[PDB]
Amino acid sequence: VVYLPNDYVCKKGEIGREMYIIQAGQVQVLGGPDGKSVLVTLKAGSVFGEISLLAVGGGNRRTANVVAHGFTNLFILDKKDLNEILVHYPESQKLLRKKARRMLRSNN
Amino acid sequence: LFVLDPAGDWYYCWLFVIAMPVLYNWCLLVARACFSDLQKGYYLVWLVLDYVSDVVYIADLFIRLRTGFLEQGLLVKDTKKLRDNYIHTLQFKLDVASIIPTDIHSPEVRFNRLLHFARMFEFFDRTETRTNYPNIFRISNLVLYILVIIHWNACIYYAISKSIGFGVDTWVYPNITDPEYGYLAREYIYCLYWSTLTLTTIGETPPPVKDEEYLFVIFDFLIGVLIFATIVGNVGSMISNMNATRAEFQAKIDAVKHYMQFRKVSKGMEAKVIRWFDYLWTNKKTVDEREILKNLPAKLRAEIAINVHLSTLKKVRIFHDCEAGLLVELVLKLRPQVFSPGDYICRKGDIGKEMYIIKEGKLAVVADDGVTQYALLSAGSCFGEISILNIKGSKMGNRRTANIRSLGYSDLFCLSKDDLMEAVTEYPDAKKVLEERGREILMKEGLLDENEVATSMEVDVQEKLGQLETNMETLYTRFGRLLAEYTGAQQKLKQRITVLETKMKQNNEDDY
């Protein structure tokens, strides 16, 4: 998927259901007291939002605004696609569920 | 500092400014070199025009140093990066060689300006994508190429005639000293006529006399064959492109018309299908909406679908308090539907699993006899909202309770039961609110309470056996787990009571 400049890849409080891989371009994680202030700029080869794939329906909400800086080409893996893949790999499914529990327990 | 954007509008306005001197140099330099009367007669005009062209040629060099380029999706505005991107290219070499100073006023020393022609081809390429009329420009651009070749060939014929000698034989241009032939209006117009007559291969040119003259006419005929075949190929490919929409539509009607005569479709239904295809062509609704926007990304597709359906979808009672994220999911699920006049959207007693929103057209709630109408549904109205909700108990049983008929052609957008279920997988709280609102509406109608003790079970005997196997494996882990927490406490329990037992038992020895 190609994003136009200043497009919102992720919006704060929106549903997170995808994992993005930056093939080209940059994205900016906007945050601050004022807001809309660049905190970190992710160049090509970066992967962000991967934790939203392990969440249940409605489980994950985006916590910061991610804005494309220029024309950004991203590779996206939807949660539905991962769920459709995982039915053929019960061992990896169990491993990912265990990792989800560990992520939930350790962060809280 | 100022940096130009190639996609920008101002860059295209410069492209017209530079292409005019380039086109002037390609047309007038060959003519002034070959037709000496043109050069001497209008020497002051060429003196001004040559300076103006050279100023633009130098300016284009400075512009080329200040056009940005996209690097990682960002326009580059760094002065050193723009200079290094342009200088090492081949185009810098042609552009410098184009504007190299001549160190005579003759037009022949200015032939280096014929280089850097790429700015002229770029303008034509840029104009074609920008113009609303792409075929009119493509013909006009093609005709201009013919005129430049014909004009160039006209000047070569006059130059060859000068080299051989004017009037030495019948093939060359006649004697200049003769006042009947020796003036600039006659010699250009006849040579233009000769070049057109020879390149187009239509009329008959005067026969050549010498072997050098035979070669030039053979070359023109060979060149004119390639030009004419390219003309027919370009125009013939344009005509195929303009007709392609109608040609593929006529194939669909012909394919359907073959099926109706093959399967003996009744004439009442056959004329209904024919009348439908005339509506599609007349109102230009032949292409499907889903096929049009399938290439667009989901963000751009959602942005378009918000502007079409979000105003009407928020008027639906159940979607009153829906979240902004869910509403974007719903408007992407809507599917267009077109109904002929008198068509039944839904009938009483028919299973209903869709909700329809009227984009355009008038629908009428009608009785069992179609003519009598209870109510009228205009554009923006919705019906069937409760059918897509899976209420636990409904006296309706997802069956339509009204007959809806279209008075004329109506455009409907349908949200199905499955599409609503898919949208609310990620919005579980909203699903609960939608069902509660539908339950409240069903109370007001009086059609809610049903199936209190009625439940349907379709689990397979092998699948129901699976839960019995599954429940057994879960309990055995608990049997170890319940005891391990308890026995460790029980192992802890025995020592702590015993030490209190033994110490108090020793007290009894002190008692007596």
XYZ file of C-alpha atoms in Angstrom:
620
model
C 0.000 0.000 0.000
C 1.326 3.443 -0.974
C 0.605 6.330 1.403
C 0.439 9.959 0.315
C 2.467 12.565 2.247
C 1.154 13.485 5.714
C -1.272 10.548 5.636
C -2.212 8.907 8.930
C -0.845 5.370 8.933
C -2.042 4.965 12.533
C -4.418 7.243 14.435
C -4.489 7.378 18.223
C -7.468 5.504 19.622
C -8.236 3.690 16.378
C -8.400 -0.084 16.074
C -5.061 -1.773 15.445
C -5.365 -4.842 13.248
C -2.264 -4.793 11.014
C 1.525 -4.962 10.972
C 3.367 -2.525 8.708
C 6.757 -2.989 7.036
C 8.317 0.183 5.626
C 9.490 -0.744 2.132
C 10.212 2.873 1.172
C 9.741 6.301 2.666
C 9.529 7.352 6.294
C 6.858 7.552 8.977
C 6.833 9.764 12.065
C 5.429 8.824 15.481
C 3.875 12.139 16.474
C 3.651 12.871 20.188
C 4.175 15.515 22.813
C 2.502 18.024 25.125
C 1.365 20.106 22.156
C 0.907 17.068 19.950
C 1.919 16.644 16.304
C 5.606 16.731 17.290
C 7.970 14.125 15.861
C 9.280 11.716 18.493
C 10.938 9.078 16.288
C 11.314 8.791 12.504
C 11.302 5.233 11.157
C 13.136 4.726 7.867
C 12.811 1.840 5.414
C 13.080 -1.684 6.770
C 11.251 -0.851 10.005
C 8.369 -2.952 11.325
C 5.804 -1.433 13.682
C 2.386 -2.380 15.003
C 3.121 -6.108 15.205
C 1.522 -6.458 18.655
C -1.941 -5.727 17.223
C -1.931 -9.052 15.358
C -2.042 -11.127 18.556
C -4.966 -9.183 20.035
C -8.559 -10.428 20.063
C -11.265 -8.497 18.218
C -11.264 -4.992 19.638
C -8.314 -5.851 21.872
C -5.745 -3.443 20.436
C -6.156 0.324 20.165
C -3.423 2.448 18.609
C -1.694 4.570 21.245
C 0.035 7.186 19.069
C -0.335 8.905 15.714
C 1.936 7.607 12.948
C 2.165 9.938 9.950
C 3.815 9.225 6.603
C 6.626 11.636 5.697
C 6.415 11.874 1.936
C 5.223 9.069 -0.300
C 5.503 5.928 1.837
C 5.213 2.373 0.513
C 4.272 -0.090 3.257
C 3.808 -3.856 3.336
C 0.807 -4.768 5.480
C -0.191 -8.121 7.046
C -3.836 -8.017 8.312
C -4.838 -9.827 11.563
C -7.425 -11.805 9.582
C -4.673 -13.042 7.253
C -2.505 -14.141 10.181
C -5.494 -15.856 11.803
C -6.218 -17.696 8.550
C -2.562 -18.750 8.337
C -2.332 -19.914 11.960
C -4.988 -22.639 11.652
C -2.472 -24.846 9.810
C 0.267 -24.394 12.458
C -1.057 -25.297 15.929
C 2.426 -25.252 17.480
C 3.114 -21.708 16.284
C -0.433 -20.752 17.282
C 0.209 -21.969 20.835
C 3.594 -20.217 20.892
C 2.018 -16.934 19.767
C -0.745 -17.237 22.370
C 1.889 -17.871 25.054
C 3.818 -14.813 23.866
C 0.592 -12.783 23.992
C -0.020 -13.844 27.602
C 3.580 -13.006 28.511
C 3.268 -9.586 26.850
C 0.022 -8.922 28.726
C 1.411 -10.082 32.081
C 4.860 -8.465 31.907
C 3.670 -5.023 30.783
C 0.849 -4.792 33.327
C 16.356 29.139 -2.182
C 13.787 28.154 -4.822
C 13.459 24.568 -6.061
C 11.024 23.572 -8.801
C 8.715 20.566 -8.529
C 8.452 18.461 -11.722
C 4.936 17.339 -10.800
C 4.169 20.970 -9.999
C 2.192 23.291 -12.229
C 4.930 25.920 -12.620
C 7.298 23.331 -14.108
C 4.797 22.639 -16.897
C 4.430 26.360 -17.610
C 8.199 26.497 -18.072
C 8.031 23.473 -20.388
C 5.949 25.506 -22.824
C 8.404 28.407 -22.526
C 11.429 26.310 -23.508
C 9.700 24.176 -26.168
C 8.871 27.190 -28.358
C 12.537 28.130 -29.072
C 13.314 24.442 -29.623
C 10.487 24.086 -32.144
C 11.515 27.367 -33.783
C 15.113 26.161 -34.114
C 14.017 22.854 -35.643
C 11.842 24.556 -38.270
C 13.603 27.811 -39.154
C 17.306 26.917 -39.063
C 17.102 24.404 -41.918
C 14.982 26.825 -43.955
C 17.342 29.774 -43.480
C 20.371 27.675 -44.435
C 18.729 26.288 -47.578
C 16.658 29.299 -48.698
C 19.130 32.179 -48.856
C 16.333 34.646 -49.623
C 14.825 33.825 -46.218
C 18.091 34.545 -44.406
C 19.016 37.788 -46.182
C 15.484 39.154 -46.487
C 14.531 38.917 -42.805
C 17.989 39.185 -41.251
C 16.825 41.620 -38.566
C 13.959 39.322 -37.540
C 16.312 36.364 -37.091
C 18.782 38.538 -35.167
C 16.197 39.287 -32.471
C 14.706 35.781 -32.438
C 18.087 34.049 -32.161
C 18.985 36.115 -29.093
C 15.642 35.406 -27.404
C 16.045 31.667 -28.013
C 19.577 31.700 -26.587
C 18.434 33.495 -23.426
C 15.838 30.772 -22.810
C 18.457 28.100 -23.553
C 20.741 29.484 -20.828
C 17.787 29.876 -18.455
C 16.830 26.224 -18.959
C 20.312 25.238 -17.782
C 19.703 27.116 -14.531
C 16.215 25.608 -14.223
C 17.605 22.081 -14.673
C 19.904 22.745 -11.713
C 16.819 23.673 -9.635
C 14.297 20.902 -10.389
C 13.812 18.621 -7.417
C 13.436 14.871 -7.540
C 11.723 12.391 -5.245
C 14.104 10.440 -3.011
C 12.375 8.106 -0.533
C 9.128 9.882 -1.375
C 10.477 13.326 -0.453
C 11.358 16.117 -2.862
C 15.074 16.912 -2.712
C 15.720 20.631 -2.199
C 19.465 20.490 -1.470
C 21.520 22.599 -3.883
C 24.457 20.189 -4.039
C 22.220 17.138 -4.455
C 20.326 18.708 -7.363
C 23.533 19.828 -9.086
C 25.192 16.414 -8.767
C 22.079 14.653 -10.082
C 22.021 16.760 -13.270
C 25.692 17.403 -14.083
C 26.750 13.764 -14.440
C 23.830 12.922 -16.746
C 24.029 12.814 -20.529
C 21.391 15.557 -20.750
C 23.840 18.046 -19.226
C 26.261 17.273 -22.062
C 23.642 17.870 -24.769
C 22.362 21.011 -23.040
C 25.849 22.516 -22.754
C 26.735 21.528 -26.327
C 23.453 23.084 -27.466
C 24.252 26.543 -26.089
C 27.980 26.558 -26.991
C 28.824 29.975 -28.508
C 29.822 30.276 -32.159
C 33.306 31.808 -32.213
C 29.642 33.905 -38.571
C 25.996 35.071 -38.493
C 25.110 32.161 -40.796
C 22.337 29.750 -39.710
C 24.651 26.751 -40.205
C 26.809 27.535 -37.164
C 23.647 27.522 -35.019
C 22.821 23.879 -35.784
C 24.054 22.934 -32.303
C 20.799 24.451 -30.998
C 19.025 21.502 -32.656
C 20.354 19.499 -29.716
C 18.487 19.726 -26.384
C 15.342 18.795 -28.354
C 14.291 16.612 -25.398
C 12.591 19.605 -23.779
C 10.226 19.774 -26.762
C 9.344 16.061 -26.635
C 8.826 16.320 -22.871
C 6.331 19.175 -23.318
C 4.298 17.138 -25.807
C 4.444 14.150 -23.443
C 3.437 16.379 -20.531
C 0.593 18.058 -22.433
C -1.008 14.746 -23.442
C -1.429 13.599 -19.838
C -2.727 17.046 -18.839
C -5.272 17.618 -21.658
C -8.950 16.569 -21.249
C -8.942 15.754 -25.015
C -6.104 13.141 -25.404
C -6.981 11.892 -28.926
C -7.404 15.371 -30.429
C -3.951 16.335 -29.153
C -2.430 13.023 -30.280
C -3.642 13.646 -33.836
C -2.477 17.272 -33.662
C 0.903 16.182 -32.298
C 1.194 13.536 -35.024
C 0.284 16.022 -37.775
C 2.959 18.428 -36.511
C 5.592 15.694 -36.852
C 4.497 15.144 -40.465
C 4.761 18.871 -41.180
C 8.277 19.122 -39.740
C 9.449 16.143 -41.814
C 7.751 17.512 -44.943
C 9.250 20.967 -44.351
C 12.691 19.458 -43.717
C 12.474 17.363 -46.895
C 11.410 20.469 -48.828
C 14.586 22.265 -47.765
C 16.826 19.302 -48.631
C 15.309 19.214 -52.126
C 16.125 22.898 -52.616
C 19.627 22.351 -51.226
C 20.192 19.392 -53.560
C 18.872 21.451 -56.485
C 21.288 24.252 -55.586
C 24.176 21.774 -55.410
C 23.341 20.162 -58.757
C 22.403 23.530 -60.254
C 19.086 25.263 -60.859
C 17.535 24.444 -64.212
C 20.224 22.035 -65.423
C 17.588 19.313 -65.846
C 13.877 18.749 -65.319
C 14.067 17.140 -61.869
C 15.789 19.973 -59.966
C 14.153 23.277 -59.072
C 13.968 25.680 -62.056
C 16.305 28.588 -62.763
C 16.554 31.227 -60.032
C 17.705 33.870 -62.531
C 14.389 33.419 -64.358
C 11.982 35.899 -62.689
C 9.107 33.433 -63.156
C 10.696 31.023 -60.654
C 13.160 33.118 -58.652
C 11.375 34.507 -55.611
C 11.064 33.228 -52.068
C 7.296 32.681 -52.065
C 7.483 30.458 -55.148
C 10.530 28.394 -54.229
C 9.400 27.463 -50.727
C 5.794 26.724 -51.701
C 6.756 24.582 -54.697
C 9.387 22.717 -52.678
C 6.792 22.208 -49.948
C 4.482 20.855 -52.651
C 7.220 18.619 -54.072
C 8.090 17.250 -50.626
C 4.442 16.509 -49.799
C 3.806 14.997 -53.237
C 6.844 12.712 -52.897
C 6.626 11.656 -49.244
C 2.889 10.922 -49.246
C 3.305 8.663 -52.337
C -0.124 9.725 -53.648
C 0.638 11.910 -56.655
C 3.275 11.634 -59.356
C 6.600 13.426 -58.991
C 8.668 14.534 -62.003
C 11.020 11.713 -63.011
C 14.675 11.956 -61.977
C 17.424 12.292 -64.561
C 20.708 11.483 -62.789
C 21.704 8.528 -60.568
C 22.208 10.947 -57.666
C 18.652 12.187 -58.201
C 17.295 8.631 -58.394
C 18.749 7.859 -54.958
C 17.129 10.882 -53.293
C 13.652 10.056 -54.616
C 14.084 6.399 -53.623
C 15.063 7.539 -50.122
C 11.981 9.779 -49.923
C 9.701 6.951 -51.052
C 11.231 4.577 -48.494
C 10.927 7.234 -45.786
C 7.380 8.041 -46.896
C 6.394 4.381 -46.610
C 7.554 4.275 -42.986
C 5.789 7.569 -42.267
C 2.516 6.481 -43.868
C 2.514 3.089 -42.134
C 3.176 4.842 -38.815
C 0.312 7.272 -39.491
C -2.183 4.479 -40.164
C -0.943 2.481 -37.180
C -1.277 5.451 -34.830
C -4.705 6.549 -36.076
C -5.923 2.963 -36.349
C -4.886 2.258 -32.763
C -6.698 5.391 -31.578
C -9.932 4.315 -33.278
C -9.708 0.928 -31.554
C -9.327 2.663 -28.182
C -12.337 4.963 -28.600
C -14.528 2.103 -29.845
C -13.344 -0.354 -27.163
C -15.999 0.678 -24.628
C -18.830 0.218 -27.132
C -17.294 -2.891 -28.716
C -17.055 -4.746 -25.405
C -20.561 -3.601 -24.451
C -22.039 -4.805 -27.751
C -20.405 -8.189 -27.156
C -22.213 -8.491 -23.815
C -25.601 -7.797 -25.418
C -24.842 -10.202 -28.268
C -23.796 -12.890 -25.783
C -26.988 -12.397 -23.761
C -29.126 -12.220 -26.920
C -27.700 -15.579 -28.011
C -28.599 -17.137 -24.653
C -32.238 -16.014 -24.714
C -32.861 -17.460 -28.172
C -30.995 -20.638 -27.180
C -32.963 -21.196 -23.959
C -36.287 -19.950 -25.435
C -36.697 -17.101 -22.954
C -40.217 -15.671 -23.117
C -40.718 -12.449 -25.056
C -41.928 -10.534 -22.003
C -38.717 -11.288 -20.114
C -36.584 -10.983 -23.263
C -37.760 -7.418 -23.884
C -37.147 -6.626 -20.206
C -33.473 -7.563 -20.588
C -33.126 -5.581 -23.830
C -34.693 -2.511 -22.207
C -32.240 -2.856 -19.312
C -29.145 -2.770 -21.529
C -30.432 0.381 -23.289
C -30.677 2.076 -19.869
C -27.078 1.134 -19.062
C -25.695 2.596 -22.282
C -27.836 5.746 -22.370
C -27.055 6.752 -18.776
C -23.460 5.400 -18.924
C -23.809 2.841 -16.125
C -22.125 -0.017 -17.997
C -19.037 -0.364 -15.782
C -19.384 -1.900 -12.327
C -18.464 0.266 -9.344
C -16.508 -2.518 -7.624
C -14.300 -3.082 -10.671
C -13.618 0.656 -11.013
C -12.202 1.215 -7.524
C -10.570 -2.178 -6.924
C -7.083 -0.803 -7.633
C -7.419 2.041 -5.119
C -5.997 1.577 -1.610
C -8.345 0.973 1.293
C -7.665 4.434 2.733
C -8.568 6.220 -0.509
C -11.524 3.898 -1.114
C -12.829 4.641 2.380
C -12.413 8.377 1.761
C -14.572 8.148 -1.368
C -17.181 5.927 0.307
C -17.514 8.325 3.255
C -18.547 11.160 0.944
C -21.231 9.021 -0.722
C -22.885 6.986 2.036
C -21.959 8.348 5.473
C -24.656 11.040 5.491
C -27.428 8.519 4.802
C -25.967 5.705 6.917
C -25.862 7.895 10.033
C -29.596 8.551 9.581
C -30.271 4.868 10.322
C -31.754 4.423 13.795
C -29.572 1.489 14.857
C -26.379 3.223 13.638
C -27.218 6.390 15.593
C -24.470 6.090 18.226
C -22.041 3.931 16.239
C -18.328 4.620 16.529
C -16.530 6.466 13.737
C -14.361 3.424 13.029
C -17.353 1.124 12.570
C -19.090 3.517 10.174
C -16.079 3.456 7.842
C -16.230 -0.348 7.930
C -19.938 -0.347 7.045
C -19.783 2.055 4.085
C -17.063 -0.110 2.534
C -19.418 -3.108 2.757
C -22.241 -1.464 0.779
C -22.888 -2.993 -2.646
C -24.693 -1.131 -5.455
C -27.977 -2.500 -6.781
C -30.075 -1.208 -9.691
C -33.739 -2.119 -10.171
C -35.916 -1.714 -13.258
C -39.328 -0.007 -12.953
C -41.887 -2.248 -11.309
C -39.213 -4.517 -9.837
C -39.839 -5.956 -6.381
C -37.067 -5.203 -3.908
C -38.647 -7.616 -1.431
C -41.975 -9.384 -1.018
C -44.030 -10.187 2.064
C -43.065 -13.599 3.398
C -39.638 -13.640 1.725
C -36.465 -14.272 3.714
C -34.639 -11.022 4.372
C -30.917 -10.837 5.147
C -30.102 -7.388 3.724
C -30.714 -3.722 4.489
C -31.160 -1.346 1.549
C -30.400 2.382 1.343
C -31.882 4.340 -1.567
C -29.195 6.392 -3.291
C -31.548 7.482 -6.080
C -35.049 6.614 -7.171
C -38.437 6.208 -5.528
C -39.636 2.996 -3.895
C -43.224 2.312 -2.865
C -44.558 0.122 -0.080
C -47.394 -1.708 -1.807
C -50.177 -4.172 -1.062
C -50.549 -7.695 -2.460
C -51.999 -6.010 -5.526
C -49.093 -3.934 -6.782
C -51.006 -0.785 -7.726
C -52.214 0.157 -4.241
C -49.402 1.757 -2.233
C -49.246 2.316 1.526
C -46.181 4.571 1.695
C -43.392 6.034 -0.425
C -39.656 5.672 0.209
C -37.538 8.429 -1.334
C -33.787 8.799 -1.778
C -31.946 8.556 1.522
C -34.487 6.212 3.116
C -33.460 2.834 4.491
C -35.377 -0.368 5.161
C -34.545 -3.861 6.336
C -32.308 -2.608 9.146
C -33.595 -5.194 11.623
C -33.053 -8.072 9.171
C -29.273 -7.721 9.388
C -29.351 -7.775 13.208
C -29.258 -11.291 14.682
C -31.694 -10.720 17.526
C -31.957 -13.764 19.794
C -35.754 -13.852 19.752
C -37.779 -12.385 16.894
C -41.384 -13.035 15.925
C -40.379 -11.825 12.453
C -38.032 -14.752 11.835
C -35.997 -12.635 9.348
C -38.926 -12.588 6.910
C -40.061 -9.429 5.137
C -43.313 -7.912 6.391
C -43.912 -5.481 3.501
C -43.928 -5.470 -0.299
C -41.463 -2.919 -1.705
C -41.637 -2.007 -5.392
C -39.662 0.422 -7.545
C -41.676 3.020 -9.447
C -38.736 3.704 -11.756
C -35.036 2.940 -12.004
C -33.586 3.091 -8.496
C -30.023 2.785 -7.219
C -29.870 0.863 -3.945
C -26.918 0.061 -1.697
C -27.297 -3.169 0.260
C -25.678 -4.078 3.572
C -26.002 -7.811 4.146
C -26.262 -9.767 7.382
C -22.841 -11.364 6.875
C -21.167 -8.033 6.085
C -22.503 -6.523 9.309
C -21.187 -9.537 11.245
C -17.740 -9.153 9.684
C -17.629 -5.422 10.460
C -18.517 -5.837 14.152
C -15.955 -8.573 14.879
C -13.529 -5.809 15.840
C -16.217 -3.708 17.586
C -17.791 -6.028 20.179
C -19.346 -3.306 22.346
C -20.995 -1.725 19.303
C -22.504 -5.093 18.334
C -24.176 -5.253 21.753
C -25.632 -1.750 21.328
C -26.913 -2.560 17.828
C -28.714 -5.674 19.065
C -30.174 -3.858 22.082
C -31.511 -1.052 19.878
C -33.016 -3.598 17.494
C -34.530 -5.404 20.474
C -36.121 -2.154 21.676
C -37.603 -1.488 18.222
C -38.969 -5.029 18.090
C -40.673 -4.454 21.459
C -42.508 -1.401 20.113
C -43.765 -3.403 17.127
C -44.785 -6.223 19.461
C -42.737 -8.856 17.604
C -39.923 -9.596 20.092
C -40.728 -12.349 22.595
C -40.228 -15.836 21.076
C -38.019 -18.996 21.432
C -37.696 -18.699 25.234
C -37.513 -22.511 25.431
C -36.709 -23.174 21.749
C -33.092 -23.816 20.732
C -31.602 -25.517 17.659
C -28.576 -27.826 17.913
C -26.655 -28.844 14.776
C -23.414 -30.122 16.359
C -22.214 -33.351 14.752
C -22.083 -36.605 16.723
C -18.311 -36.684 16.026
C -17.967 -32.996 16.970
C -19.981 -33.390 20.185
C -17.739 -36.378 20.926
C -14.758 -34.028 20.627
C -15.801 -31.909 23.613
C -16.074 -35.059 25.735
C -12.520 -35.968 24.717
C -11.418 -32.349 25.206
C -12.953 -32.064 28.684
C -11.124 -35.188 29.877
C -7.629 -33.948 28.991
C -8.276 -30.630 30.755
C -9.313 -32.314 34.012
C -6.181 -34.470 34.305
C -3.920 -31.406 34.282
C -6.139 -29.948 37.040
C -5.812 -33.167 39.090
C -2.059 -32.659 39.231
C -2.431 -28.887 39.555
C -5.077 -28.868 42.305
C -3.044 -31.322 44.387
C 0.348 -29.664 43.819
C -0.934 -26.391 45.273
C -2.689 -28.288 48.073
C -0.118 -30.984 48.919
C 2.634 -28.377 49.181
C 0.372 -26.520 51.590
C -0.525 -29.870 53.191
C 3.182 -30.718 53.485
C 3.612 -27.272 55.031
C 0.552 -27.883 57.228
C 1.876 -31.010 58.952
C 5.117 -29.498 60.284
C 3.597 -26.268 61.628
C 0.949 -28.080 63.683
C 3.460 -30.696 64.883
C 5.916 -28.152 66.311
C 3.004 -26.534 68.154
C 1.909 -30.043 69.176
C 5.304 -31.141 70.507
C 6.092 -27.910 72.375
C 2.700 -27.967 74.110
C 3.086 -31.691 74.845
C 6.346 -30.903 76.655
C 4.428 -28.346 78.744
C 2.291 -31.192 80.138
C 5.441 -32.735 81.636
C 6.004 -29.474 83.533
C 2.370 -29.499 84.707
C 2.601 -32.553 86.974
